[PDB]
Amino acid sequence: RPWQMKDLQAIKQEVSQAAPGSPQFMQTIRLAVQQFDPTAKDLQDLLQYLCSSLVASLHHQQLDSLISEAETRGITGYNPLAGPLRVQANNPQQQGLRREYQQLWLAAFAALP
C-alpha cells in the first residue's frame, strides 16, 4: 500500500510555504513516514519531489553521518555481511532496519536549520 500521486501532491502543497525542518514540515513528514511505512527507495523519491538538489545533498550528508554512527555502534537487526543499511531497509523482512532508516531520515532532515 505505497502512497499514490495524490498523497504526495497533498504533502507537498500543505507545506509549500514552510521551510525544511520547520515544526510544521516535521509534523507532516513524520506523519507520512509513520503512516505509509515506506522503504529507503520511496523516501528518496519523496525527498527528490520535495526539496531541491542542494537540500537533497545536505540531507544526504547528514544522514550518512547519522547512519554511520548508528550502525558503527552496532544495531540489533543489522548484519554488515549482507549489504548497506540502504539495501537491508529495502527488504520487506527487515522491518527493524526500515524503522531505524525512517527515524535517521527524519532526524537528519530536521537537523538542517
Numbering used by the authors: 13 to 125
Give me lines lifted from the publication on this model.
The retroviral structural protein Gag forms the immature protein shell of nascent virus particles. All retroviral Gag proteins contain three canonical domains: matrix (MA), capsid (CA), consisting of independently folded N-terminal (CA-NTD) and C-terminal (CA-CTD) domains, and nucleocapsid (NC). During immature virus particle formation, these domains function in membrane binding, viral lattice self-assembly and viral genomic RNA (vgRNA) packaging, respectively. Our results show that HTLV-1 uses a distinct CA-NTD arrangement to form the immature Gag lattice and that, in contrast to other retroviral structures, the CA-NTD is the key determinant of immature HTLV-1 assembly.
To analyze the structure of immature HTLV-1 lattice interfaces in more detail, we engineered an HTLV-1 Gag truncation construct for bacterial expression, purification, in vitro assembly and analysis by cryo-ET. The MA126CANC tubes exhibited varying helical parameters. Tubes were sorted into nine groups and each group was processed separately by subtomogram averaging. The in vitro assembled tubes had the same arrangement of the CA-NTD layer as the full-length HTLV-1 Gag VLPs (Cα root-mean-square deviation (r.m.s.d.) = 1.2 Å), underscoring the biological relevance of our in vitro system. The CA-CTD layer in the tubular arrays was arranged in a similar way as in the VLPs produced from cells, also forming a layer of disconnected dimers. However, in this case, the qualitative difference between CA-NTD and CA-CTD was even more dramatic. The CA-CTD density in different individual tubes did not permit structural analysis other than coarse positioning of the CA-CTD dimer, as the CA-CTD layer was only visible at lower resolution (compare Fig. 2d and Extended Data Fig. 6d). Nevertheless, this allowed us to assess large-scale changes in the CA layer between the different tube geometries. Unlike the CA-NTD layer, the CA-CTD layer was observed to have larger movement of its domains. While the distance between the adjacent symmetry-independent CA-NTD trimers was nearly constant (42.1–42.6 Å), the distance between symmetry-independent CA-CTD dimers was skewed such that it was decreased in the direction of tube curvature (31.8 Å) and increased along the tube axis (35.6 Å).
